[PDB]
Every structure is written in structure tokens, then in C-alpha cells.
């Protein structure tokens, strides 16, 4: 993680993907002032592991991409460090059914 204020150097932004599988994330202070996951409007997002993700896929007889998608630029993916292909798990406080658990893949 590299927290950057004001503006980062545009010449310096072309090196983050080039790195080997070891990633390098940057986060601005602008969204760092308030933890958005504490805001009760935003549901609590949680990661998923390979085994349970494969279990979900076998339960629903689906493809990777047929699931709903969450975008790589989503502010909560910036919080949770989601890679491309990590099925986030969201908890839906649905008024109709109290606690409900849904998903959105990150691709």
C-alpha cells in the first residue's frame, strides 16, 4: 500500500501492473478520511476463499462470469484489495428478510 496525497506523478502510475504477482496498491487520503464500511448504508463486504467459491459454483452450476459483477474501481474493492476473480460476499439487510447474503464477483 502507498498512500498518496494531492496528486501522484502520472509518469509513476505506469509501473504498478508491470510488477510480478506481488502487487502494489495506492490509496488517496480523500477516501481515507472516513471508513466507508462503517457507513451503515454500505453493507459489510467479505472476501471468499478458493474452496468455498468452487463450492458455490458447483452448487449453482454456473460459470465464473455469469455471477453479478463488482467493478475493479469500486470504492469497497479499494478497501478490500479484491483481485480479478475474487467473489466478494455481501450481507444484505433486506427489510423483507432481515439478514440476506448475496455476492458480486470482481472482474
Amino acid at each position: 500500500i502507498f498512500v498518496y496525497q494531492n496528486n501522484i506523478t502520472p509518469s509513476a502510475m505506469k509501473l504498478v501492473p508491470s510488477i510480478p504477482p506481488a502487487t502494489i496498491e495506492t490509496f488517496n487520503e480523500a477516501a481515507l478520511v472516513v471508513n466507508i464500511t462503517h457507513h451503515e448504508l454500505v453493507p459489510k463486504h467479505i472476501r471468499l476463499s478458493s474452496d468455498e467459491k468452487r463450492e458455490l459454483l458447483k452448487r449453482y452450476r454456473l460459470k465464473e462470469s455469469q455471477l453479478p459483477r463488482i467493478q475493479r474501481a469500486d470504492p469497497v474493492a479499494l478497501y478490500l484489495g479484491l483481485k480479478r476473480g475474487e467473489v466478494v460476499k455481501i450481507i444484505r439487510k433486506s427489510e423483507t428478510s432481515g439478514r440476506y447474503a448475496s455476492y458480486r464477483i470482481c472482474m
Binding site: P17, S18, P20, A30, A31, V33, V34, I36, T37, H38, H39, E40, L41, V42, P43, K44, H45, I46, Y60, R61, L62, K63, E64, S65, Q66, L67, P68, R69, I70, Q71, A73, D74, P75, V76, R84, G85, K89, I90, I91, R92, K93, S94, E95, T96, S97, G98, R99, Y100, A101, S102, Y103, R104, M107
Partner: protein, 1462 residues
């Protein structure tokens, strides 16, 4: 269709493609030679447009097929045009590919490394690999380096595809979804943009000339540059022929075949066919058969087909250019008349232009040039009256009738009155069998006139015989030989079909346009009546169809196959739709006169003797017609025994229930109320509540609330306890009961019901005559002048005139005066009705039907008998003429309620002409508003339903569109059916009826084929887990335990239920008040939940679209359909009215809250300037700009702005904006006292100002009072006159003093339902995130959706969407289910972005037919043919296009047949 000629084969998909130029030549049965369509003698001409080779034509045997006009299907031919013509469909793609191409090296003017990168990415996306296509960009790290990059990237992509195919993430055909389609289109779009941006070709270094276009069929290029030629020379508006562009494109496409195969194939190309660039050019046209180009005789006039016209025009130009080529060879040998040779060569060029434009006209009418224009092929299938919508989505149909509807309360509520004329015309082919010959022989004997009868008899060989012109003995022979063995071997499994008339056995489809929701098209068992020629309909269905009898008519479709009969009889029949899935509220029930008769028969004052009681019961029931259950009518004990046996009306209702309700089943122990307050019946009355018990009525009265458009009634509970069938029979039986009753004791209304008493009139008159002072005081208060001032006051008149001129002031005045006169009206109504009427309820029949809900309302009664009241034009009183008069009679600027549209009259004693005029204005406005609102919701509903029309619950309880993509895992999170959730939370009723509910929720009959342990065990486990974790913020709570339905099948595992349901069930089981025990009650509630689940394949998307569109017919933040379409139809980030809700800390004061609001709210420079004075002096052209400021003590404490801050603003923003404005205007033009020296520091500031700015010469801002600020200004002498007022004003308005960005005010609204809130006129979350001392930043919820999406996440965006969509429905209290709205939100956030419901929001869908039928059929057709998309035939629209059984509902499964023998 016929049911005895099945079709072995069936279409399974369809893939678009380009018709190759040589296959048509191989295909074509004849070329098209000469334009002349027909010669004389009425004969076709060989080589014309009506050749016999193109199909049969008017008893001319087809020279290709040899059949006649009834059997020749047509045969395509081709016209060979010499010069290849641009295909107008793909002109933009042709331009894109021709441009950004280097004819020098025959490659794209782009680096081969980047081109190969894009090609590899696309070949990866073809198999659905989305992450691989992004990690491909990790290899970047000169010929050797570039070739190494190519080799490694291609090896990596091949390995990635091999891994995907081995694992199973793809097949040989490829993995294509909505997300993959989005990624592929995004990548292709960026690739085209990157390609059409470069300068000189980067693969060789050579420049290439540019191209241009004047539209379509208009191609041109350009010349090089003076420096470019030098670059080219050291490296080493001309017209372009169509064949030249083709020759350019052929080479480059042969070179880039790899990238072009990965662009022009969204699926992996199995056929490995090439991508030939001649596809963009139509070398040869196709002529549709004479069958599709026939003419018609409109009497004696015969019209030549427009397709023939355009094709003959194209062929005329073809013959022109061909015969012009004959004489171009004449000058070939004589190469000395080259000038005239160049003349005819320009003629040949213009003929090329003409033929290309002729083909452009033949395809797209608008792509022609010249200013009745003939429709083209694109125009023939483009729009609403095109082909897809007018002939594939909806078609005229056979065996369907139509007539005016009329009422008939003597048919069962699941029936319809079929006139005899239809019953002898509509038919149904009944294949004769040994169980039908008794009635089918009779139908054949009776023939086509005597119902029941038959019209045709279809023979075993499929041949037809007509009974229309036969004799009785002939038809007798036919009927006696009807069923007989067939000696023909081929048709040894077929039998005769008799086209019998429609009996009462069958079922029919009824539909009253417009079909706002699905309930407006149900099924009715037919009953044939020998009355007039009109359809007769029961009264309960008027609510479902929204139908009246004022001249209404509705289509009556007759299903012609057992599949459709069983469909309409079980899924769509009118009884199976008691409630609507909009909100789960009832939609059926008796309407007006049955209700008003119920208020009388169930009145406590009504008794009926033995004879009258028994007559009523028998007439209502008629056991011979099946209304009973005990094979003999049963009775009741009379209420009274001495002197003589009397009964009661409530006993009549009780025995009616007892006779319809099935025996050995407890009666409905119901507790509810109705629309009639206790004080109406007198002191000590308890009639407000009804107390049903054991199938007996014991208190209160029946009403609209217990049958009709009201919930929790007796018929609703009969529904909830015995299904919808018994409720339907109760509706029918009460319809026949209150009808025969109302004949004996009729119901009427008259002038006596509309009167008052002397005291009532006195009260009315006095409280009305207060209105003079009422209106004057409203005006005086609004104008802020002193109260109790005479109306003729000049200041009052002036203020009223200013208010009239200003729209907002007029609105404020109207609102205040309207509130006052509404207060006066309410006082009058309360004091008079019901305490003043000379005739009182229940005698006062008008008031009775207003109270009872049969018709009208308390408002209607009040304005008939007491006061018509203030008239509302839009949200105002009445438009006022510019002279200030509201009418000719009323004096200008009159302070008077009667002038301001407040009518004091009543319809009983008439209205004065001025009030008549105002009331006419208001009524006309209402009519216009209704006329607009009828059509406003049509586009909204159609747009929603075109996209949601496929989504349907999978057999895994998850809802997912027909392409497979998943929108939600549970419907609303609970899988609870909207219709079936009627009484899930009505535990008191459930307990009261447990013993009756058991007979349907039989455990011993529904326990074995289920698991009853695991779900309940895990449920208790998770329940205890959640209880133990107690209360903690949702981001802290663990997720070790999930909802039970997520892991356990809600339909296979008992006890797997929602979480709200469990909490409320335990809370109401905490009563501990009574056989029935908690275990049996719990088990029965859980079986109820198990049977209350949406069945798989339910058309949930259609249902939600209807539930969100149909209520929209009855429609400061935007409200109504505008808000709804803004949320869903457009998804506009430029939302008209954005706001954010800011909770404030409980430990703050109100005054501090206002201080913080004014600290945040935006202030502009113009807010604090009384007047700015400009002194244009030319003797160089000086401009003293002296600005007057408001009182410092006032504006400092109104805006929280200080002298120092204003000084900074003027010194930095305002002067510079003004200077830029002055200099820009000149650039475009060519085409109080003071002291001479404030102090030395002031003079240094002045010098700094002069140095900093360009043509300023003075400056000084009062720092001790903040009352003025001047700055002298000059320009040169060449400039003209300048306004120096409008520019100053606009710059002043733009320039800001203290603004939080994206916020333009912060008001303090009065708290509602607690939870104090500060709401602004903008959205900027970053701004208040810094301020936590006041705002509870953790709970800011804003009006916008894009803002919250990009600053908080997709799920916060979906929350905001549901909240906003419910909010607009919540101003009118049209409560729609929280499941439809969430389904809409998650369908419009299914790609991680805020998507709308329009053509832009459906681009990334696999079904091209859906988009083409929706709109812009051409553009979606190009996007499907060019990528060679294989339409998979799974969206409902595609099925309708091709003719395949829809998969939603009864098409979500298949049907087998267990044979008995090997």
C-alpha cells in the same frame, strides 16, 4: 396450426452472416436484365422483374418450380451490377477500416506489437477469459525485441486457452456472456479509437493520405502537407472510386487476417473461413420473389410494387452504365477525342454515383439524396409500424371475436356471456373418438346454424369438408359415417376432426385494452346465452379489467389446443387471480350496489320471516347447480321464537357461508372492522367491528371492507383458508344474494338525501361568511404588512402587484391563502356533516354510499351538501390576468377568497357563474392531466418489460435472465411469493384457524417426501448464534453462520425460512396464551412458509415491470413519473435535484446547527452587493467600478462572511474573472466619500494589484466598514463601446465568496419521525467527511445514485436506488412490494455500474433479437452480423421471432412418456 400433422425437425439456433457474392449466383434462378416490368397483353417479360423464374404470377406456371400460385414458394434471383457498391449498412465500419490503414506497406498505421496485443486479448476474450486478457499486459518489460514479445504473448495466450479448456472453464464453442460481451465491446471500442488516432504509419514510418465523406454514398480523399512530403521524401479533395476502395481494403485485410478474425468473430471461428473485405461491397443484388413483390387490385386501380419500382430504377442505371461502356470502347481505338472521352468519363463517374445512390435508396430510404420518398428495406422493418413489432411481436389472430360488454350478475364469476352469433361462428376442431361421437355426431347433424353445431369436418387424409351448403340427409350420412376405419395405410393413426361450435364446456381469453397489468387478461368458462349480440360479464371482474359498461368492448380469443385450454384454465383463469402480485392486495369483489345492499341486510334493524329468509337462501344457493356441499340445503335456528319465528340478516349471511363452505371444517373465526364509525349508529353501538365465529356473523356489519377493494375481509379470509375457489364461489353467491334481495327492498337516492336542517344551514352560513376577513388576512399576512389593514391600502396593492409579477411570490401567497380557506372549509364540513343533514344515515342513502365505500367519498358528500371548496389549478388557486384581475367581474388585485378561486357554493343550491368558470377551469385541467398520464407510463412500462421480460426464477430458487446471468439468489431475500404472503405475519388469525388450516397443510401427507430435521436444527443453531452476538455494528459481526435457505433448500427442507419471519414468530409466540400447542403451531407455520414460495419459472421480471409501471398510471425533490424515469429510464448522473441527508450530533444545539449550516452553504459574490456603479469616462477610456455593499452588521451575521474574506475574494477571483471577460469581449469585438491616501500598506496593496492584473489602474476596498470597493479600469482607443454592466453582473454572479464545491445551500428542515437531518442543495461527500464535530458522517444518505456509487460502492448505490424508487411510490401511498423494487435495482446494477433501461443499457446482451425488436433494428443488426453472433434462441423475444415455445413457465421443462414394452 394442426395437431395431427406434427413436425419432426425443429430450429435450435440462428447465426447471422454476410451473403457471399458467388453463392447467390449459384443460388439465383434468373438474372434481372431489363427494367421494363411488364409489357402489354397482360403478360410477363423474360429478363424483367416478373419473370416466371422468380415465382408464379397470376395463373402462370412458375418456370422454376412448375407449381401454381397456391404452391410456388418463390425463387430468389440476382441483378448483377457492374461497379461494386458500398453496402450502406456497414458504411461506418468500412470507413473505420479504410481509415487508419497504410496503403504504402499494406498494414494498419499502428505498431504491430500493439496490434498483436489487441488480437491476443480478443482471442482470449472469445473463450470468456476476462482476467487473463488483463494479465496479458504484464509482459511489456528493435525487431528482435518485438518478435520476442510476439512469441511470448502468443505462447502465453495459447497456454491460457489450453488451461481453460482443460479445467472446463470453456468449451470448443467458446464462453460468451453479458460480462464477456461488455469486455469485448469495450476492448474493440478502445482498439478502434487507438487505431483511428495515429499520424504516420508506425510500422514503416510513411505518411498516408487522409479520407473524408459528405455522408453516405459520398467518398473523397485529400492531399498531403508541405512538411509531410518532405518527411515522406526522406523516409523513402480527390474522389475515390468504389472499386478503388475495395482494392485498397482487399490487400490490408489479407495482411491483417489475424486481427480481423479476432474482431469479426465474437465466437471462436470453427469454420476457419477467411474475412474477405468484399463483404462491405454489394457486387450483386438479390431480388425477392414475385410472391413478396405481388401487386394488388384496389378495384380497377392496380399499384406497381415499390420494391419493383426501386429495383427497376437500379436496373435502369445499370443498363445506362453498361450501354455507356459500349461507346467508351468506341473512343478506345480513337484516342484523339480525349476531351469528349473525358466528358463521357465524367458521365461514367456520375453514373457510378447514381447507381451507388440507387442501391443506397433501395436499402435505406434516408441514405438517398434528393428533396413521398419510397420506403426502403430498412424502413420496412425499423419502427413501430415496421416488421418486427407490427408482425412478429403482435399479430392479428384467427378464432378471436370482439363485442361491447354488458353486465350480467347471473353468471358465475368465472364465466362470460357469449352471444349466440359468436357461438355459431367460433369453432374448435374436436378429433372424433369413441367418447365424443354422441355429441360430435349431433353437432354434425345440426350443422353450422343450430348451436351446438359444426361448420367443417376435416377428413382423415387431412382433407376438409364444408357443411355450409348441405342438406339434412346429406349431413346425416356424413355424421353416421363420421367415425369409421381408414383404409388408407399412410393415415392409419389419424381420425376425423369436427370443427364444432363453442359450447359451455370450453374456456376463453378476455382482454380489455390497454393491458396495463397481467390481470387484465384472464380466462373464463363460456356460458352461451340466447340474448343480444354482446359479451356479458360479471361485476367482480370490472375491477380486474378496469372495465366499465359505458360502451366498452374487449377482445375474446378462443384457444384452439388442449395446451392452451389447460393453460387458461389453471394459470390464468379469473379465480386463480384473486389478488395482484403488485402488493398482494385483493383485486376482486362486488363493487357498489351489492355493498350498499349489504349495509342494509346486515344492519341490526333488519329481520326476515321464515318465508323471506328461506326464499333468499334458496335463490342465492340453488343446490342443483353445485353451490352446496351437503347434497341438501341446511338451515339455522330462528333468532326469535315468540310471538312468531323471525330471523336476522346476519343469520342469512351465516347460513350462506354454512351452505357454501365445505363441511367438517371450522368456520372463519375472523376479527376485523369496516368503514363505518360507531357513533353513526348511536350511543352504545359496537358495529364498527365485525366478530365472525365458527362460520357465523355476530357483530358489526358487512361492508365494502369485507368484499371488494379492501384487505383482511371475510372473503379474503375465506380465500386464505379454502383457497381461491371457495372465495370465488362466495363472491358469486353473495352476488346472487344481494341481487335477489335488492329486488325486494330496493335502494334509491333523491333530493331529500341531499338536504340539511335549519340549524345546519345556519352553522354553514356563519362559518362560511367568516371567509371575507379570512381572505383579507391571508393577503395582509403574506405581504408582511400590518394585520387588519384595509384592502384599499396603496402599499398592500403595490405588494400584491409585485407578488403577481413574481412567480415564487405568487406561489407563496396562493399556498398561504389556500391553507386558510381549507381550514375554513374543514370547519364547515365538520360542524355540518353529519350533524346537520335532515336525513341521517342509514336513511340518507347518499351519505350511506359515501360512508360504505360503495361509491364516492366523504369529500363528494361534503361538496354536494355543504361546500364545494377551494379550486386547485395545478398547485395554485387560479391564473391571474396581467391586469391583476382573476375574472372580468372581480376588481384588480382583490383580496377575496371567492376571487381567488374559493367557491362557497354547493352543488345542491347551484354555483354562481364566476365559480362555474373556475370549476370548469379546474375540471378541464383534470381532464388534460389524465389524458397525459394515460400515455406517460406506457413508455416506462414497455422499456422496463423489454429488458426484464426474460428473467424468471430458476429451479434453484434464484432469479436469472434467460441468457443465464444471475441477478439475485433469492426473490427479495426470502423466496416469499407476493400473492401467498397474505397472512404469514397474521399469527393471531393463523392460531384462530389452525384446525381449519391443518386440513390443507396435512403434515402426514406432506412429511415423508421431505427432510424435517436438518433445516430446523441449523435454524436453531444460527438463531442462537445471532441472539448471543446481541447488538453490534454490522461491520463487526461475524459471518460464521448464514441464513438457512442459503445452505438448505427452502422447498425440500422444512423449517428453512427467512430471518424476519422467525423473529416476528417468536415475538408473537411470547404471548403464552393458549388443543393448540406451540409445537403444532410452529410446524404448521413452517409448512405454510414452505408452501408460500415462488414457483420456479415464474415470470418475476415481467411481474415486477408491471408492478412498477401500472401504478405509475396513477401518479421539492422530483416526484412521480419524472422521478421514476430519472431513476430507472435514464440513470442520469446530472440528476435535476440532488440532495444529501446529514445527521447531526445529538450533543449540538439548534442555534449551533444553524450556524454550521450557514458555514457550509454556498454564498456568491452577488449576494452582498446592493448595486454596482460603472462610470464610463472616455476623455484614456476610464471605467470607475464602485460596488455598494450591504450593511456589514447584517451580511456578516447572515452569511458568516467577513471584511477580510470579501477583500480576498475581490482581490483574487472577481477582478481576474472580470478582466478575462473584458479582454475576451474585446478580442471577439474585432471579428459616499473617501480619502486620497488610506495608508502606505494600502498603497502597497494597490501597487501589488496593478502589477498582478493587466489593464487595471486603481483599487481600494474598505477594510473598516466593508461598504465599497472600487477599481479603475481602462483599455486602448481602438476598442469600440462596451456594456460594462451585463458583463459585470454575470461575472459577479459567477464569482464565489465561500463555497463548498458541489453544494449550493444547506437548509435546516424540521425533523420528521425523529432523527434531525440537515439537507443541502448538492452532493459532495468528501467535504463533510472532514467535518465530524457536527455531522454524523457515518449516516449520510444522499439523493444521487452515481455519486453514491462512485464514492461508497455498488451496494450503497443499490440501497439508494431502492430507497428512491420506493420514495416516489410513497408520496401517493401506492405501496409496491419491497421485492419488485430490489429486483429492479439489482437488475440495473448487474454489471457493477449504474445502468438504465434503454438501448444503451441493453447493448451487452446475447439476444440480438431483443435489441432489434426493441429499437434501432438496423444498428443492432449490423453489430450482430459483423461479429457473426449466433443468436442462441433463448430470450423470449427471440423465441417469438422464430416460433419456438417460450421457456418461461410451462416451457421451463420437457415431457417424456414411459412406454410399457421394449
Amino acid at each position: 396450426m394442426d395437431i395431427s400433422k406434427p413436425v419432426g425437425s425443429e430450429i435450435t439456433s440462428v447465426d447471422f452472416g454476410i451473403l457471399t457474392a458467388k453463392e447467390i449466383r449459384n443460388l439465383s434462378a434468373k438474372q434481372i436484365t431489363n427494367p421494363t416490368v411488364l409489357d402489354n397483353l397482360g403478360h410477363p417479360v423474360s429478363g424483367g422483374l416478373y419473370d416466371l423464374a422468380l415465382g408464379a404470377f397470376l395463373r402462370n406456371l412458375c418456370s422454376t418450380c412448375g407449381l401454381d400460385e397456391k404452391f410456388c414458394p418463390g425463387h430468389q434471383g440476382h441483378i448483377e451490377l457492374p461497379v461494386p457498391c458500398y453496402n450502406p449498412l456497414f458504411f461506418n465500419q468500412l470507413y473505420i477500416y479504410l481509415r487508419a490503414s497504410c496503403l504504402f506497406c499494406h498494414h494498419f498505421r499502428l505498431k504491430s506489437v500493439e496490434v498483436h496485443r489487441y488480437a491476443c486479448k480478443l482471442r482470449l476474450l472469445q473463450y470468456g477469459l476476462i482476467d487473463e486478457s488483463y494479465k496479458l499486459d504484464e509482459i511489456t518489460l528493435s525487431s528482435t525485441l518485438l518478435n520476442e514479445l510476439k512469441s511470448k504473448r502468443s505462447e502465453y495466450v495459447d497456454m491460457a486457452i489450453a488451461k481453460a479448456l482443460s479445467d472446463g472453464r470453456t468449451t470448443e464453442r467458446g464462453s460468451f456472456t453479458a460480462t464477456v460481451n461488455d469486455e469485448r465491446k469495450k476492448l474493440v471500442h478502445e482498439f478502434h479509437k487507438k487505431l483511428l488516432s495515429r499520424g504516420k504509419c508506425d510500422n514503416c514510418g510513411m505518411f498516408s493520405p487522409k479520407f473524408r465523406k459528405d455522408g453516405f454514398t459520398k467518398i473523397f480523399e485529400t492531399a498531403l502537407n508541405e512538411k509531410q512530403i518532405t518527411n515522406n521524401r526522406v523516409k523513402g479533395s480527390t474522389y475515390i472510386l468504389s472499386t478503388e476502395v475495395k482494392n485498397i481494403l482487399d490487400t490490408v485485410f489479407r495482411k491483417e487476417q489475424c486481427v480481423l478474425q479476432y474482431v469479426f468473430h465474437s465466437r471462436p471461428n470453427l469454420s476457419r473461413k477467411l474475412v474477405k473485405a468484399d463483404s462491405f461491397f454489394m457486387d450483386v443484388l438479390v431480388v425477392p420473389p414475385t410472391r413478396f413483390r405481388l401487386p394488388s387490385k384496389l378495384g380497377e386501380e392496380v399499384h406497381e410494387n415499390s420494391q419493383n419500382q426501386l429495383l427497376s430504377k437500379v436496373l435502369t442505371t445499370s443498363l445506362l452504365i453498361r450501354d455507356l461502356n459500349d461507346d467508351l470502347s468506341k473512343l478506345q481505338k480513337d484516342k484523339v477525342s480525349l476531351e469528349d472521352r473525358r466528358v463521357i468519363f465524367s458521365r461514367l463517374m456520375n453514373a457510378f454515383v447514381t447507381i451507388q445512390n440507387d442501391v443506397n435508396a433501395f436499402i435505406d430510404s434516408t441514405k438517398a439524396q434528393g428533396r413521398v420518398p419510397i420506403p426502403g428495406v430498412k424502413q420496412a422493418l425499423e419502427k413501430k409500424e415496421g416488421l418486427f413489432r407490427k408482425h412478429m411481436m403482435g399479430k392479428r389472430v384467427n378464432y378471436a371475436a370482439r363485442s361491447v360488454i354488458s353486465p350480467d350478475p347471473n353468471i358465475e364469476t368465472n364465466e362470460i356471456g357469449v352471444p349466440p352469433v359468436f357461438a355459431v361462428k367460433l369453432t374448435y376442431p374436436e378429433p372424433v373418438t369413441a367418447y365424443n361421437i354422441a355429441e360430435l355426431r349431433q353437432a354434425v347433424i345440426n350443422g353450422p346454424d343450430k348451436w351446438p353445431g359444426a361448420t367443417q369436418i376435416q377428413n382423415e387424409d387431412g382433407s376438409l369438408v364444408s357443411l355450409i351448403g348441405m342438406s339434412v340427409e346429406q349431413r346425416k350420412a356424413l355424421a353416421n359415417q363420421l367415425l369409421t376405419p381408414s383404409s388408407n395405410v399412410s393415415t392409419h393413426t389419424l381420425n376425423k376432426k369436427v370443427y364444432r361450435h363453442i359450447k359451455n364446456r370450453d374456456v376463453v381469453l378476455m382482454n380489455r385494452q390497454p393491458t396495463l397489468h397481467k390481470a387484465s387478461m384472464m380466462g373464463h368458462k363460456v356460458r352461451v346465452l340466447p340474448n343480444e349480440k354482446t359479451l356479458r360479464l360479471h361485476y367482480a371482474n370490472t375491477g380486474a379489467y378496469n372495465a366499465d359498461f359505458d360502451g366498452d368492448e374487449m377482445n375474446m380469443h378462443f384457444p384452439q389446443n388442449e395446451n392452451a385450454r389447460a393453460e387458461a384454465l389453471n394459470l390464468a383463469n379469473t379465480d386463480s387471480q384473486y389478488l395482484t402480485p403488485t402488493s398482494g392486495s385483493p383485486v376482486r369483489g362486488l363493487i357498489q350496489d351489492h355493498i350498499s345492499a349489504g349495509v342494509w341486510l346486515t344492519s341490526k334493524d333488519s329481520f326476515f320471516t321464515r318465508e323471506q329468509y328461506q326464499q333468499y337462501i334458496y335463490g342465492c344457493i340453488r343446490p342443483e347447480d353445485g353451490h352446496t356441499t351437503r347434497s341438501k340445503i341446511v338451515t339455522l335456528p330462528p333468532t326469535i321464537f315468540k310471538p312468531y319465528p323471525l330471523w336476522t340478516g346476519k343469520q342469512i349471511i351465516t347460513t350462506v357461508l354454512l351452505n357454501v363452505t365445505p363441511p367438517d371444517m371450522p368456520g372463519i373465526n375472523l376479527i376485523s372492522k369496516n368503514k363505518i364509525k360507531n357513533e353513526y349508529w348511536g350511543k352504545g353501538s359496537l358495529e364498527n367491528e365485525v366478530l365472525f365465529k365458527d362460520g357465523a356473523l355476530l357483530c358489526g356489519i358487512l361492508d365494502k371492507s369485507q368484499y371488494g377493494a379492501s384487505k383482511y375481509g371475510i372473503v379474503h379470509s375465506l380465500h386464505e383458508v379454502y383457497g381461491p375457489e371457495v372465495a370465488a364461489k362466495v363472491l358469486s353467491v353473495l352476488g346472487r344474494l344481494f341481487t335477489n334481495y335488492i329486488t325486494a327492498t330496493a335502494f334509491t337516492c333523491g333530493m331529500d338525501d341531499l338536504r340539511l336542517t335549519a340549524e345546519g344551514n345556519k352553522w354553514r352560513t356563519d362559518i362560511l361568511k367568516t371567509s371575507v376577513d379570512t381572505g383579507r388576512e391571508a393577503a395582509a399576512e403574506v405581504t408582511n404588512l400590518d394585520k387588519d389593514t384595509p384592502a384599499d391600502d396603496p402599499e398592500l396593492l403595490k405588494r400584491l402587484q409585485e407578488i403577481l409579477r413574481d412567480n415564487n411570490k405568487s406561489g407563496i401567497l396562493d399556498a398561504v391563502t389556500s391553507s386558510k380557506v381549507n381550514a375554513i372549509t374543514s370547519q364547515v364540513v365538520s360542524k355540518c356533516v353529519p350533524d346537520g343533514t335532515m336525513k341521517k344515515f342509514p336513511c340518507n342513502s347518499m351519505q350511506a354510499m359515501a360512508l360504505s365505500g360503495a361509491k364516492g367519498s366523504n369529500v363528494n358528500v361534503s361538496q354536494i351538501m355543504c361546500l364545494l371548496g377551494q379550486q386547485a389549478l395545478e398547485g395554485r388557486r387560479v391564473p391571474v390576468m396581467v391586469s391583476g384581475k382573476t375574472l372580468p367581474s372581480f376588481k384588480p388585485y382583490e383580496t377575496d377568497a371567492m376571487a381567488g378561486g374559493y367557491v362557497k357554493g354547493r352543488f345542491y343550491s347551484g354555483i354562481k357563474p364566476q365559480e362555474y368558470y373556475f370549476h370548469c377551469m379546474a375540471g378541464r385541467e383534470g381532464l388534460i392531466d389524465t389524458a397525459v398520464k394515460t400515455s406517460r407510463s406506457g413508455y416506462l412500462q414497455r422499456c422496463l418489460t423489454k429488458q426484464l421480460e426474460g428473467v424468471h426464477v430458476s429451479y434453484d430458487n434464484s432469479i436469472r435472465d434467460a441468457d443465464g446471468t444471475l441477478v439475485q439468489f433469492m426473490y427479495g431475500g426470502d423466496a416469499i411469493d407476493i400473492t401467498k404472503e397474505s397472512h404469514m405475519t397474521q399469527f393471531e388469525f393463523c392460531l384462530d384457524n389452525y384446525y381449519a388450516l391443518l386440513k390443507k397443510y396435512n403434515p402426514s401427507a406432506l412429511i415423508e417426501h421431505l427432510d424435517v430435521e436438518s433445516a430446523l436444527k441449523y435454524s436453531k443453531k444460527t438463531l442462537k448464534y445471532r441472539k448471543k452476538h446481541s447488538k453490534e455494528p454490522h461491520y463487526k459481526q461475524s459471518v460464521k453462520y448464514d441464513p438457512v435457505l442459503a445452505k438448505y433448500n427452502p422447498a425440500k427442507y422444512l423449517g428453512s425460512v427467512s430471518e424476519n419471519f422467525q423473529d416476528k414468530l417468536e415475538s408473537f409466540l411470547d404471548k403464552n396464551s393458549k388443543g393448540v400447542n406451540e409445537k403444532k403451531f410452529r410446524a404448521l407455520m413452517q409448512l405454510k412458509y414452505m408452501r408460500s414460495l415462488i414457483n420456479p419459472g415464474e415470470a418475476v421480471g415481467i411481474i415486477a415491470s408491471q408492478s412498477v409501471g401500472e401504478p405509475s398510471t396513477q401518479m421539492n425533490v422530483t416526484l412521480g413519473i419524472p422521478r421514476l424515469r430519472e431513476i430507472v429510464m435514464t440513470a442520469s448522473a446530472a440528476i435535476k435535484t440532488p440532495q444529501m441527508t446529514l445527521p447531526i450530533w445529538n450533543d449540538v444545539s439548534d442555534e449551533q446547527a444553524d450556524t454550521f449550516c450557514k458555514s457550509i452553504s454556498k454564498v456568491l459574490l452577488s449576494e452582498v452587493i446592493d448595486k454596482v456603479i460603472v462610470t464610463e469616462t472616455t476623455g484614456a477610456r476610464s471605467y470607475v467600478i464602485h460596488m455598494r455593499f450591504f450593511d456589514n452588521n447584517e451580511y456578516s451575521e447572515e452569511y458568516d462572511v467577513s471584511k477580510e474574506e470579501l477583500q480576498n475574494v475581490i482581490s483574487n477571483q472577481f477582478i481576474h474573472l472580470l478582466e478575462a471577460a473584458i479582454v475576451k469581449e474585446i478580442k471577439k469585438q474585432k471579428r459616499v466619500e473617501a480619502n486620497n491616501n488610506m495608508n502606505k500598506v494600502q498603497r502597497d496593496r494597490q501597487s501589488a494589484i496593478i502589477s498582478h492584473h493587466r489593464f487595471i489602474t486603481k483599487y481600494n476596498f474598505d477594510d473598516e466598514s466593508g461598504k465599497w470597493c472600487e477599481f479603475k479600469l481602462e483599455l486602448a482607443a481602438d476598442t469600440e463601446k462596451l456594456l460594462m454592466v451585463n458583463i459585470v453582473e454575470e461575472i459577479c454572479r459567477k464569482s464565489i465568496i465561500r463555497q463548498i464545491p458541489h453544494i449550493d445551500r444547506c437548509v435546516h428542515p424540521e425533523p420528521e419521525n425523529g432523527k434531525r437531518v440537515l439537507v443541502t442543495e448538492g452532493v459532495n461527500f468528501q467535504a463533510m467527511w472532514d467535518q465530524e464535530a457536527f455531522i454524523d458522517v457515518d449516516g449520510i444518505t444522499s439523493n444521487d445514485v452515481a455519486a453514491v456509487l462512485k464514492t461508497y460502492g455498488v451496494e450503497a448505490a443499490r440501497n439508494t436506488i431502492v430507497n428512491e424508487i420506493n420514495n416516489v411510490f410513497s408520496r401517493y401511498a401506492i405501496s409496491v412490494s419491497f421485492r419488485h423494487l430490489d429486483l429492479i435495482a439489482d437488475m440495473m446494477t448487474r454489471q457493477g455500474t449504474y445502468l438504465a433501461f434503454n438501448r444503451q443499457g441493453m447493448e451487452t446482451s446475447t439476444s440480438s433479437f431483443m435489441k432489434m425488436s426493441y429499437e434501432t433494428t438496423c444498428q443492432f443488426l449490423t453489430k450482430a452480423v459483423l461479429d457473426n453472433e449466433r443468436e442462441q434462441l433463448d430470450s423470449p423475444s427471440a423465441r417469438i421471432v422464430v416460433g419456438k415455445l417460450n421457456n418461461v413457465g410451462t416451457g421451463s421443462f420437457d415431457v417424456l412418456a414411459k412406454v410399457p414394452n421394449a
